[PDB]
Amino acid sequence: NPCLSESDASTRCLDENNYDRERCSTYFLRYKNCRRFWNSIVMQRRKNGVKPFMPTAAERDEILRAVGNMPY
Numbered sequence: 001n002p003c004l005s006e007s008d009a010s011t012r013c014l015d016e017n018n019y020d021r022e023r024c025s026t027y028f029l030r031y032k033n034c035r036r037f038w039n040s041i042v043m044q045r046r047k048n049g050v051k052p053f054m055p056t057a058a059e060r061d062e063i064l065r066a067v068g069n070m071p072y
Contacts, residue, residue, distance in 0.1 A: 001054060003034035006072060030072040037071035 010027035014020060021028075041063060042053040055063060064071075 001035060001038050003031040003072060006031040006034065034072045 006027045010021075010024050010031075013024040013027065017023065038055070041055055045051060045053045045055070
């Protein structure tokens with residue numbers, strides 16, 4: 001599952017500067033951290049095997065509240 005916050009801001013960076021995808025590598029790193037976090041939540045829901053595992057908007061909200069910071 002993608003991280004559209006780091007997707008838009010990395011595209012804005014790369015557009016500003018020479019398509020310098022390696023000098024904005026930190027955004028793609030925070031995107032892989034975001035992928036790993038939400039894949040962790042998917043696996044922590046999949047232990048019961050019964051709901052849609054990819055968290056819905058109010059789950060993403062209450063879970064971000066329960067981290068108390070950005071997982072990115």
